[PDB]
Amino acid sequence: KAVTFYEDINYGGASVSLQPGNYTLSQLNTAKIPNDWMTSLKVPSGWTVDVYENDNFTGTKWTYTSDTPWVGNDANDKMRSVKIYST
Amino acid sequence: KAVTFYEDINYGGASVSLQPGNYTLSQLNTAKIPNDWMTSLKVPSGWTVDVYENDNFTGTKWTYTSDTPWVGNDANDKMRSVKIYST
Numbered sequence: 001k002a003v004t005f006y007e008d009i010n011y012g013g014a015s016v017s018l019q020p021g022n023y024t025l026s027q028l029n030t031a032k033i034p035n036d037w038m039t040s041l042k043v044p045s046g047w048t049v050d051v052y053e054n055d056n057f058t059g060t061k062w063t064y065t066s067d068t069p070w071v072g073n074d075a076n077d078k079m080r081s082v083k084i085y086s087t
Numbered sequence: 088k089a090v091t092f093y094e095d096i097n098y099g100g101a102s103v104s105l106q107p108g109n110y111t112l113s114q115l116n117t118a119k120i121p122n123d124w125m126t127s128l129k130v131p132s133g134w135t136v137d138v139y140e141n142d143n144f145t146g147t148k149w150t151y152t153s154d155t156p157w158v159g160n161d162a163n164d165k166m167r168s169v170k171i172y173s174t
């Protein structure tokens with residue numbers, strides 16, 4: 001079980017999987033996730049993904065609790081930090 | 088659906104709408120919300136707005152879960168950071 005983040009719409013392009021945790025921009029980059037890059041994601045059942053517009057879990061927050069082929073026009077290519085929960 | 092913050096009592100004066108997220112003072116300013124300015128707000132049903140006296144989600148916290156024509160004497164013109172939840 002992991003959250004997989006995808007570069008392109010409908011789970012296309014480059015992908016990176018992450019376990020639960022609170023990942024800053026620098027930490028995302030080390031995990032090979034660039035800024036302003038995420039477009040779709042797969043979320044395990046029962047899990048929560050809080051996607052933040054700015055670093056350090058600030059700015060607009062978009063929340064996903066299931067597989068999402070398109071994050072929305074506002075959220076597209078905006079992720080700079082993320083909190084992942086298995087609850 | 089958005090939280091709309093208003094300059095004056097009873098939803099008067101300048102207004103700015105924000106999606107869920109954790110907004111610092113600088114982020115509020117970029118969204119055109121000055122410090123010590125907010126007097127009333129509209130909150131979508133089921134949402135929570137935590138209004139903080141100081142930057143970075145510290146100091147006194149005032150909580151609103153419905154449309155509020157007057158934030159209260161203590162809370163008036165004090166917002167410097169805010170957390171908005173759709174839950």
Ligand SMILES: [Ca+2]
Binds near residue numbers: 006037038
């Ligand atoms: Ca993309």
Ligand SMILES: [Ca+2]
Binds near residue numbers: 124
């Ligand atoms: Ca005011």
